[PDB]
Amino acid sequence: STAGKVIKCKAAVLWEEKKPFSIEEVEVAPPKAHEVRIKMVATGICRSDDHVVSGTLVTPLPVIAGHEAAGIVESIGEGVTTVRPGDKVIPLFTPQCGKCRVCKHPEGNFCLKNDLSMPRGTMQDGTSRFTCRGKPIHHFLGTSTFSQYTVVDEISVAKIDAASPLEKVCLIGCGFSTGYGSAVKVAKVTQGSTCAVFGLGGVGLSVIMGCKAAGAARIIGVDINKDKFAKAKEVGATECVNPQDYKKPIQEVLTEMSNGGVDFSFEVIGRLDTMVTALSCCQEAYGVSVIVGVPPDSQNLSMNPMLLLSGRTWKGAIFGGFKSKDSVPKLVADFMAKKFALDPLITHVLPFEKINEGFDLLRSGESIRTILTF
Amino acid sequence: STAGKVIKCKAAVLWEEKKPFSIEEVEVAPPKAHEVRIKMVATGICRSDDHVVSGTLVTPLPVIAGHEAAGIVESIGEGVTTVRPGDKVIPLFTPQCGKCRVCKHPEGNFCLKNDLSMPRGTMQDGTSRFTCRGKPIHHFLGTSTFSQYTVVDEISVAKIDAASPLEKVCLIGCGFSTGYGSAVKVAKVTQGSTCAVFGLGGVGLSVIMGCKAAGAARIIGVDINKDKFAKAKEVGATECVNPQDYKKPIQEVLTEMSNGGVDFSFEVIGRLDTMVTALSCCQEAYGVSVIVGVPPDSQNLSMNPMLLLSGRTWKGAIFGGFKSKDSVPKLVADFMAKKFALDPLITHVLPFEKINEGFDLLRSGESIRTILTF
Ligand SMILES: NC(=O)c1ccc[n+]([C@@H]2O[C@H](COP(=O)([O-])OP(=O)(O)OC[C@H]3O[C@@H](n4cnc5c(N)ncnc54)[C@H](O)[C@@H]3O)[C@@H](O)[C@H]2O)c1
Ligand SMILES: NC(=O)c1ccc[n+]([C@@H]2O[C@H](COP(=O)([O-])OP(=O)(O)OC[C@H]3O[C@@H](n4cnc5c(N)ncnc54)[C@H](O)[C@@H]3O)[C@@H](O)[C@H]2O)c1
Ligand SMILES: [Zn+2]
Ligand SMILES: [Zn+2]
Ligand SMILES: [Zn+2]
Numbered sequence A, B: 001s002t003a004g005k006v007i008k009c010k011a012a013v014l015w016e017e018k019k020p021f022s023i024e025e026v027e028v029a030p031p032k033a034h035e036v037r038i039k040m041v042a043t044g045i046c047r048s049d050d051h052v053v054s055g056t057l058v059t060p061l062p063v064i065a066g067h068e069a070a071g072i073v074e075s076i077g078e079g080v081t082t083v084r085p086g087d088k089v090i091p092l093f094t095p096q097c098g099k100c101r102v103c104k105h106p107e108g109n110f111c112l113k114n115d116l117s118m119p120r121g122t123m124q125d126g127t128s129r130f131t132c133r134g135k136p137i138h139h140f141l142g143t144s145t146f147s148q149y150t151v152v153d154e155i156s157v158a159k160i161d162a163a164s165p166l167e168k169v170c171l172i173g174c175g176f177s178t179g180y181g182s183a184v185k186v187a188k189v190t191q192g193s194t195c196a197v198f199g200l201g202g203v204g205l206s207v208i209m210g211c212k213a214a215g216a217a218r219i220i221g222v223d224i225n226k227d228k229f230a231k232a233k234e235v236g237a238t239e240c241v242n243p244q245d246y247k248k249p250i251q252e253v254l255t256e257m258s259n260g261g262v263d264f265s266f267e268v269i270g271r272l273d274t275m276v277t278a279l280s281c282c283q284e285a286y287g288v289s290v291i292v293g294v295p296p297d298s299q300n301l302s303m304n305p306m307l308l309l310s311g312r313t314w315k316g317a318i319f320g321g322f323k324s325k326d327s328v329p330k331l332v333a334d335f336m337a338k339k340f341a342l343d344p345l346i347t348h349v350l351p352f353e354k355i356n357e358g359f360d361l362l363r364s365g366e367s368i369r370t371i372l373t374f
């Protein structure tokens, strides 16, 4: 195994929408200017990949999805100084350039050179690295980790502790940092406060873990699928409310149940109705609603601005407000100190060739996170 | 003059919408328990009164509007311990009871016993005091000051110092505290930041005064009426942009002028497309847009939630985040130290009987504030 050879490995190429991930053979180019090629170890299955295959994230197809992962650097670029081959890394959902306008600001992680505002499906030089049956396959958000080998940039890769169990640590890359960081850093949950969480996936259970870590008194988990409440109460949900039980709207349910509205509210579903709902179930004068789940594309809201004008605050968060190269090594380093229990997010551990199976476990609602070990 | 007699005095009663303020003879009942009856001195003309006569604030009419005022306590009710007859006070657009859930929160001024979320047009005993030709006339948000005498509550009145020129100090009651407080307290404008202000009335010029007072580098004033730019540059507007000059949409005008969007943005107009515009002209990762102007009633927005989801923050503010009985005496006390120059808001000083004239100066765009001295 040399450093500048093209690797024929296996990947899960998605060709067009509403079709299964075709696990096929791809050629992977060596690292060009300021790149890192990663032997991939464990890759989580996020709902954003289901947003790719369902069509609510418009990315240029054919694509290799996957952004929630950890791996080992196997070949290195020409001038990169952060990582060297052999050490465990996490591919970063949002890069940290260090030179841009956002990266020099005290708050703000959404770098200007990411791939989510205007998705090009490629790397920052303009050219892809995956070729499958002679045609190029697009990347996904600069990580594209549904393969045995991926190629990322230096600014979108994070060096983590060398003794990290990657099958669990791969959740720091997208899901847990989004939820936990959305609770403790974006919303800034104060002690004794009352929180509401809309959606109990890996992100929502991470929100409950963050609100419990910030010392919230009541944490209210709101979800249709009632089985997930049995998970939510073990990570901090003191109350659990199903919208399908109540013919009254759930705005007024969380209003009367939490004495006029919750203090902090979170929407991790990704639907517009629960965005407006999660805003309107806050307190009218000091409520903070954080949008976490991504909406379907080219679709707007219908929102009464008086809901904001009485005193609410309505934020958003990508990767939980965490500057990635700065916060991922200290979140894995804080996982070393057992600060958070990352085990209740993982429900299924499957090999890579069963990848569609994992997505069925994501689409039938029978799983929280399905880890793809390689 | 005694303390418990019904007083015939002149007022500007608005009977039904889209009609002039009929200045007629009203009777004012004496103040009941925990109420204050005020010799009114000077009453400013706000755009929210034009929102009453235009129909975008659904209140129960016939109503005596007007909330920007300063007066003298002339008779007192029982149980009132704060103010005593003879001292200058300011009626409060939003009360501060001190016992509610909002009034014990560190941030949040929107008290639960106000009259703006569910407007009843009366006081907390459910009973008005203005009778005109035998029929009762409704209050306006518990501070109905288009009359020579008025009756407010103890929770909705603020004792100011005895040496205050009320013809200028009456703008602390609604307008200036909304603008200045929206800049320095709700948005928390940091040192050297870049601000944008949509609308250059009394509230918008107060926003510019607050952003300059918090040390903003660039303050961009955006308004259709170009004459108002000649006022805005004397209170801090380093740049001034007209949307009517630019055939390109003003969102990417403010994005191109401020290199990716302004740091803080403010919408003090009170209309929906400028709210979505003022949100979208912030920075994608650390922008804060504050809604100030009240929208038309029961009309929603059409807003792309990705604008919030990249990292923006979208707030609102009634009375600029100021707890009223706590902040009005220290804002008049800070007017004593000449901390802010309140003269450039006042453009016209008219008597009360010319009140419709002042509203014409509000509706033709030829004035900033029209003070109604008695
Ligand atoms: N902002 C970010 O950076 C970021 C990062 C990761 C994921 N996400 C987004 O988070 C979203 C969900 O991710 P996930 O990990 O939580 O998986 P998930 O979709 O399985 O969890 C969402 C839950 O919402 C519930 N749901 C659907 N409709 C509902 C309704 N009316 N009321 C209540 N609940 C309802 C579902 O039961 C589901 O359990 C996705 O859209 C993903 O894109 C955002
Ligand atoms: N939140 C609060 O507590 C509070 C308090 C006082 C006033 N207000 C609201 O503030 C709003 C107006 O306040 P004001 O005192 O400045 O009155 P104003 O009418 O003098 O200011 C409005 C300005 O908006 C501008 N305008 C209209 N359309 C525009 C457009 N497309 N683009 C740019 N500018 C446009 C007008 O030129 C005007 O200068 C009102 O809705 C009023 O109710 C809110
Ligand atoms: Zn993910
Ligand atoms: Zn950056
Ligand atoms: Zn006003």
Ligand SMILES: [Zn+2]
Pocket (backbone or CB within 6 Å): B095, B096, B097, B098, B099, B100, B101, B102, B103, B111, B112, B113
């Ligand atoms: Zn109160």
